[PDB]
Design a protein around this ligand. Structure first.
Ligand code: HEM
Ligand code: HEM
Lengths: 145, 145
């Protein structure tokens, strides 16, 4: 199932992912927090999954939220780095899904991250072309949930 | 405390960590798997914690083990990238510790990774000086467990 989803990562899609990551991934703390605070603002219900982080309204100043946000970006760094070898991409995505499946996060839930990604990309001047590419990468993860 | 342990990362320790990571982190898949297989070989009693991975003796051919090994290297990448800011290193270490605490991995059981690190380091012509530097970084995680 994950292999079939990975098949949608065409040469052009991988190129747009790598080009946009070159910018987004250069400030993992800043963009990681931006992603999370945007998720919480647009889909407040997702906060139910992050009780451990405490007062998420503090944003960057919240050490636990910052710690999670920075760490989240390294999962994406991992994915981007494995783009050229489907076998490696698949095994890392399945590994990544394990902990999220245990948390009972469905593919539909996970997909809520698409909006925030689109907004973060747009803040760096990366249009819909790039947003759609990222939606395809997220789809590979969804296929594993 | 983790705050006191993070203070032990002196200027030269951080430098030695970076210089060795430049080489070690160049092959996350190869060195990651080497790190895991070495751990399982020298401390077979730790295999019980990795039941989900299946037959670990298969090494690189085991998709689940390869996925875990590659992923483990991105946690180390994260730590190295945070060396400049003590505040960020600490929050990323505490975040990292959460999942390991819920697996009941003690500071003593985590420290068993020091052996494998020393051996992988030596296979790349990095001696005691570097092994001790990495032991100091591992000590930061141990303080959080
Ligand atoms: C681009 C998307 C995402 C990435 C790259 C990502 C990455 C990560 C990583 C690397 C971790 C730490 C390892 C682990 O425990 O699994 C994590 C933890 C977690 N993730 Fe995901 N995640 C994403 C989206 C989501 C979404 C949409 C939810 C739920 C609405 C979610 C909920 C969680 C929770 C609750 C934790 C534990 C937080 C804590 O208590 O420290 N994740 N995620
Ligand atoms: C250099 C030290 C280590 C690093 C960087 C590391 C990194 C990681 C990462 C990134 C994960 C995935 C996220 C998570 O669920 O926490 C993980 C999972 C795990 N770690 Fe650690 N770890 C290290 C040492 C250890 C040691 C020494 C043990 C046990 C003696 C351990 C046991 C586990 C287990 C059982 C899992 C889950 C494996 C699975 O079912 O996929 N880790 N670790």
């Amino acid at each position: 199932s994950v292999y079939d989803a990975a098949a949608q990562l065409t040469a052009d899609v991988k190129k747009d992912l790598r080009d946009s990551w070159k910018v987004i991934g250069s400030d993992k703390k800043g963009n990681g927090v931006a992603l999370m605070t945007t998720l919480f603002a647009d889909n407040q219900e997702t906060i139910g999954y992050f009780k451990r982080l405490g007062d998420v309204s503090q944003g960057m100043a919240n050490d636990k939220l910052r710690g999670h946000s920075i760490t989240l970006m390294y999962a994406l760094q991992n994915f981007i780095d494995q783009l050229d070898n489907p076998d490696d991409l698949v095994c890392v995505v399945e590994k990544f899904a394990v902990a999220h499946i245990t948390r009972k996060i469905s593919a539909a839930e996970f997909g809520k991250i698409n909006g925030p990604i689109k907004k973060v990309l747009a803040s760096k001047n990366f249009g819909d072309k790039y947003a759609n590419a990222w939606a395809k990468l997220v789809a590979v993860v969804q296929a594993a949930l």
